[PDB]
Structures are given as structure tokens and as C-alpha cells.
Amino acid sequence: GPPGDRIEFGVLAQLPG
Numbered sequence: 001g002p003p004g005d006r007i008e009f010g011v012l013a014q015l016p017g
Contacts, residue, residue, distance in 0.1 A: 004014020 001013035
């Protein structure tokens with residue numbers, strides 16, 4: 001997902017809560 005707190009497929013991700 002978008003540059004958030006989680007991790008995507010090799011990048012920063014964002015969670016909905």
C-alpha cells in the first residue's frame with residue numbers, strides 16, 4: 001500500500017486503522 005507504517009511488496013505501506 002501507500003507509504004505508511006506497514007510494508008508492501010518491498011516498499012512502505014499504509015493500513016486503514
